């Protein structure tokens, strides 16, 4: 299961599109609404507990910030980074508190 | 472990072969594979039969090895095997399998009706037993 944070940066959202100029940048727009409505949190809380109960290796999705680089590219780079060193329960909250 | 052995006087049940379903007393043993057998009261004349056909029972007759037909018979009649067996639960289960095969179409129908209702009563009671066992409120 994959869980994303609300308020995903625009440079991160640029990675999901092959043509930013012609798009209307709707990626993850219906997803972040579930972080705010009451139904969605119980969906996300249950999604975290199931990941805590059933998973063995968990990774965080991190992106770099183009706006601080001298390159012409504004499109961020995505990568899963494996979280090592602990029980799955205690590395799940470690990634939660570092979300966003 | 190893409750029943092949000895002189051991009664064996013949599973397959010309004398399938017959009882037989081991009179002697030859060459590790065959055995001199004799059913005098079960219509199996003295001959050699392999150990593969036999299935040993718990009955043992006390007569000397390679004794004659008359001595094996008198040992068979005294402490009669025909009544201890058949009225043993192995044999009466063999009988049950026999009458199940010869069950006719009408008998199969009457069995189905009784079995439908035999179960219906048992199913209902188990449901009563489970519910009457469910009221448990003890800390």
């Amino acid at each position: 299961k994959t869980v994303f944070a609300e308020h995903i940066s625009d440079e991160c959202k640029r990675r999901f599109y092959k043509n930013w100029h012609k798009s209307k940048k709707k990626a993850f727009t219906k997803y972040c609404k579930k972080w705010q409505d009451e139904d969605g949190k119980k969906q996300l809380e249950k999604d975290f507990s199931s990941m805590k109960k059933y998973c063995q290796v968990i990774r965080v999705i991190a992106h770099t910030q183009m706006r601080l680089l001298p390159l012409r590219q504004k499109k961020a780079h995505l990568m899963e980074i494996q979280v090592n060193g602990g029980t799955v329960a205690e590395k799940l909250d470690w990634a939660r508190e570092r979300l966003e | 472990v190893f409750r029943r052995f092949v000895e002189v006087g051991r009664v064996a049940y013949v599973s397959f072969g010309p004398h399938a379903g017959k009882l037989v007393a081991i009179v002697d043993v030859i060459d590790q594979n065959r055995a001199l057998v004799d059913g005098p009261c079960t219509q199996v004349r003295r001959q050699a039969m392999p150990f593969k056909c036999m299935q040993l029972t718990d009955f043992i007759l006390k007569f000397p090895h390679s004794a004659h037909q008359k001595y094996v018979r008198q040992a068979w009649q005294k402490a009669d095997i025909n009544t201890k067996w058949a009225a043993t639960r192995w044999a009466k289960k063999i009988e049950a399998r026999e009458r199940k095969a010869k069950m006719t179409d009408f008998d199969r129908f009457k069995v189905m009706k009784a079995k439908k209702m035999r179960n219906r009563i048992i199913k209902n009671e188990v449901k009563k037993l489970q519910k009457a066992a469910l009221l448990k409120a003890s800390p």
Binding site: - | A101, K102, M103, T104, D105, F106, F109, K110, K113
Partner: protein, 123 residues
């Protein structure tokens, strides 16, 4: 009884399984080992093959068929046949009620399930 043309004269006890006085072929039946002593029964004499032979109507004086014969599609159960059926069954029904659950057996149909096989069944 068996008819003079080799066809078997069977009845379902029409009340039981809805099989009237009707011929059947010896070769397309199965003889179950269940019997009723129908000795001392009076099967009427006029129950021969000519009695049971199929009838026809078409076609009187009509050769080119453009107006269709919109009748006789209902084969009529003649009042005679109802009487012979009543006579036979009334003197065969009590003999069936005598042995237990023969009426229920006759009401049921034979079938093969995903278990039993015909070469193993005893009939």
């Amino acid at each position: 009884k068996q008819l003079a043309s080799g066809l078997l004269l069977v009845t379902g006890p029409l009340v039981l399984n809805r099989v009237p006085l009707r011929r059947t072929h010896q070769k397309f039946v199965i003889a179950t080992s269940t019997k009723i002593d129908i000795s001392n029964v009076k099967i009427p004499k006029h129950l021969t093959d000519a009695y049971f032979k199929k009838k026809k109507l078409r076609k009187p004086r009509h050769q080119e068929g453009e107006i269709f014969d919109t009748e006789k599609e209902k084969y009529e159960i003649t009042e005679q046949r109802k009487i012979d059926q009543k006579a036979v069954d009334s003197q065969i029904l009590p003999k069936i009620k005598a042995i237990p659950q023969l009426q229920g057996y006759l009401r049921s149909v034979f079938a093969l399930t995903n278990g039993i096989y015909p070469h193993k069944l005893v009939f």
